Design an enzyme around this catalytic site. Structure first.
Site, PDB file in Angstrom:
ATOM      1  N   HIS A   1       0.722  -1.117   0.001  1.00 48.69           N
ATOM      2  CA  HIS A   1      -0.100   0.063   0.184  1.00 48.69           C
ATOM      3  C   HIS A   1       0.830   1.263  -0.032  1.00 48.69           C
ATOM      4  O   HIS A   1       0.492   2.306  -0.572  1.00 48.69           O
ATOM      5  CB  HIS A   1      -1.014   0.038   1.163  1.00 48.69           C
ATOM      6  CG  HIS A   1      -1.689  -1.151   1.162  1.00 48.69           C
ATOM      7  ND1 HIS A   1      -1.817  -2.239   2.266  1.00 48.69           N
ATOM      8  CD2 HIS A   1      -2.637  -1.549   0.542  1.00 48.69           C
ATOM      9  CE1 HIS A   1      -2.592  -3.028   2.186  1.00 48.69           C
ATOM     10  NE2 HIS A   1      -3.369  -2.909   0.958  1.00 48.69           N
TER      11      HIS A   1
ATOM     12  N   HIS B   1       5.838   6.860   6.551  1.00 49.32           N
ATOM     13  CA  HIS B   1       5.687   6.566   5.028  1.00 49.32           C
ATOM     14  C   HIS B   1       5.077   7.624   4.380  1.00 49.32           C
ATOM     15  O   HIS B   1       4.910   8.628   4.862  1.00 49.32           O
ATOM     16  CB  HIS B   1       4.390   5.336   5.176  1.00 49.32           C
ATOM     17  CG  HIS B   1       3.056   5.487   5.908  1.00 49.32           C
ATOM     18  ND1 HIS B   1       3.070   5.787   7.067  1.00 49.32           N
ATOM     19  CD2 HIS B   1       1.990   6.487   5.182  1.00 49.32           C
ATOM     20  CE1 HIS B   1       1.634   6.284   7.406  1.00 49.32           C
ATOM     21  NE2 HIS B   1       1.220   6.753   6.125  1.00 49.32           N
TER      22      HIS B   1
ATOM     23  N   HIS C   1       2.500   8.986   0.996  1.00 47.65           N
ATOM     24  CA  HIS C   1       1.273   8.775  -0.005  1.00 47.65           C
ATOM     25  C   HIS C   1       1.456   9.671  -1.120  1.00 47.65           C
ATOM     26  O   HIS C   1       1.946  10.755  -0.857  1.00 47.65           O
ATOM     27  CB  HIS C   1      -0.150   9.122   0.649  1.00 47.65           C
ATOM     28  CG  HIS C   1      -0.491   8.473   1.898  1.00 47.65           C
ATOM     29  ND1 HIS C   1      -1.247   7.113   1.968  1.00 47.65           N
ATOM     30  CD2 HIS C   1      -0.144   8.532   3.120  1.00 47.65           C
ATOM     31  CE1 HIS C   1      -1.274   6.648   2.981  1.00 47.65           C
ATOM     32  NE2 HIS C   1      -0.632   7.280   3.874  1.00 47.65           N
TER      33      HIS C   1
ATOM     34  N   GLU D   1      -3.210  13.491   1.045  1.00 52.03           N
ATOM     35  CA  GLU D   1      -4.394  12.922   1.778  1.00 52.03           C
ATOM     36  C   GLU D   1      -5.177  14.167   2.337  1.00 52.03           C
ATOM     37  O   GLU D   1      -6.211  14.504   1.799  1.00 52.03           O
ATOM     38  CB  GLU D   1      -4.077  11.853   2.764  1.00 52.03           C
ATOM     39  CG  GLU D   1      -3.235  10.741   2.165  1.00 52.03           C
ATOM     40  CD  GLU D   1      -3.559   9.405   2.813  1.00 52.03           C
ATOM     41  OE1 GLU D   1      -3.368   9.441   4.013  1.00 52.03           O
ATOM     42  OE2 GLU D   1      -4.335   8.560   2.128  1.00 52.03           O
TER      43      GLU D   1
ATOM     44  N   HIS E   1       3.825  10.812   6.535  1.00 49.51           N
ATOM     45  CA  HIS E   1       3.062  10.591   7.908  1.00 49.51           C
ATOM     46  C   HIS E   1       4.189   9.990   8.769  1.00 49.51           C
ATOM     47  O   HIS E   1       4.530   8.915   8.404  1.00 49.51           O
ATOM     48  CB  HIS E   1       2.169   9.678   7.580  1.00 49.51           C
ATOM     49  CG  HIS E   1       0.922  10.238   7.008  1.00 49.51           C
ATOM     50  ND1 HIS E   1      -0.048   9.614   6.177  1.00 49.51           N
ATOM     51  CD2 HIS E   1       0.455  11.644   6.918  1.00 49.51           C
ATOM     52  CE1 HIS E   1      -1.049  10.453   5.674  1.00 49.51           C
ATOM     53  NE2 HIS E   1      -0.683  11.648   6.006  1.00 49.51           N
TER      54      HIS E   1
ATOM     55  N   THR F   1      -5.988   6.680   7.911  1.00 50.87           N
ATOM     56  CA  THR F   1      -6.371   6.992   6.694  1.00 50.87           C
ATOM     57  C   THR F   1      -6.466   5.680   5.735  1.00 50.87           C
ATOM     58  O   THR F   1      -6.805   5.849   4.460  1.00 50.87           O
ATOM     59  CB  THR F   1      -5.519   7.966   5.906  1.00 50.87           C
ATOM     60  OG1 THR F   1      -4.399   7.344   5.442  1.00 50.87           O
ATOM     61  CG2 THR F   1      -5.640   9.346   6.464  1.00 50.87           C
ATOM     62  N   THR F   2      -6.027   4.426   6.121  1.00 50.66           N
ATOM     63  CA  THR F   2      -6.307   3.315   5.392  1.00 50.66           C
ATOM     64  C   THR F   2      -7.131   2.379   6.283  1.00 50.66           C
ATOM     65  O   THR F   2      -6.918   2.605   7.641  1.00 50.66           O
ATOM     66  CB  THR F   2      -5.131   2.608   4.934  1.00 50.66           C
ATOM     67  OG1 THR F   2      -4.375   1.722   5.960  1.00 50.66           O
ATOM     68  CG2 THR F   2      -4.024   3.603   4.356  1.00 50.66           C
TER      69      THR F   2
END
Ligand SMILES: COc1ccc2c(CC(=O)Nc3ccc(S(N)(=O)=O)cc3)cc(=O)oc2c1
Ligand SMILES: [Zn+2]
Length: 257
Positions: A61, A91, A93, A103, A116, A195-196
């Site tokens: 992911h 990590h 995004h 995000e 993040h 958020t996942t």
């Protein structure tokens, strides 16, 4: 299984994870004119001098740089927070284009990517217990815009070739996360969620006002990564971002005027 594609992406998550439509979901648009200055907010205390990174993992992911969180080495305190939150991993995004990938948004602006840095409240003893608590986590979110390179990111971008596919990991010791931070620690804060999936509502979000700049070539290397495992059909890891969620009954507080 959940992901970011047409058939399993964020509009689908609520079927496996009904809290997807809950009262404190992340990310959110940060409406800079409606966020209230809160003068009782303390400065953020970032103490990463003793951070010990161990490894970097493509989990299918995103990719995580994990730290040794068995002692108080890299902690986040102060700001909106009560107590001590320990760094466990960071990590990013990011998007398929520079025009999208963050995000959180700011007055509906999307950044090229978002970092993040994930911390857990040491009063809950371990990360797994903390995610079950409404104040379990503190995630420091930092926007990335494309321009000049971020030198402190380059060690991360250069190891990405060794973790191209889901499940691959690589030793990654002596990485200093201080090299990823912007000059200012001015922030917005609100209560939200992972958020996942499992989208747990356990996060105190702290999102820095100042983005860091990364080069187009740096962000290009993020996009060479794969969501699939080795020997599976190639799907580039891009657009691994969940879009802004309804603010509902929440106020975003600013640390700054
Ligand atoms: C027992 O230890 C663990 C380790 C990892 C997780 C995870 C994996 C994980 O850490 N997810 C995660 C972390 C951070 C985020 S974000 N995108 O909000 O910063 C989004 C998702 C979730 C969970 O429920 O329970 C866990 C328990
Ligand atoms: Zn994240």
């Amino acid at each position: 299984h959940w992901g970011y594609g047409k058939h399993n992406g964020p509009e689908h998550w609520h079927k496996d994870f009904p809290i997807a439509k809950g009262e404190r979901q992340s990310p959110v648009d940060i409406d800079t004119h409606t966020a209230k200055y809160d003068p009782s907010l303390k400065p953020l205390s970032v103490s990463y001098d003793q951070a010990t990174s161990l490894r970097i993992l493509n989990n299918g992911h995103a990719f995580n740089v994990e730290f040794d969180d068995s002692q108080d080495k890299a902690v986040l305190k102060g700001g909106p927070l009560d107590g001590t939150y320990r760094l466990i991993q960071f990590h990013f995004h990011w998007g398929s284009l520079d025009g999208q990938g963050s995000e959180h948004t700011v007055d509906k602006k999307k950044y090229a990517a978002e970092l993040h840095l994930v911390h857990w409240n040491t009063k809950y003893g371990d990360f797994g217990k903390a995610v079950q608590q409404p104040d379990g986590l503190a995630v420091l979110g930092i926007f990335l815009k494309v321009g000049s390179a971020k030198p402190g990111l380059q060690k991360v971008v250069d190891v990405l070739d060794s973790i191209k596919t889901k499940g691959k990991s690589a030793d990654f010791t002596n990485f200093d996360p201080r090299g990823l931070l912007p000059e200012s620690l001015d922030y917005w804060t609100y209560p939200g969620s992972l958020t996942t999936p499992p989208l747990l509502e356990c996060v105190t979000w702290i999102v820095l006002k100042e983005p860091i700049s990364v080069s187009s070539e740096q962000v290009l290397k993020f996009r060479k990564l794969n969501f699939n495992g080795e020997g599976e059909p190639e799907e580039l890891m891009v657009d691994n971002w969940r879009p802004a969620q309804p603010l509902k009954n929440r106020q975003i507080k600013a640390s700054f005027k």
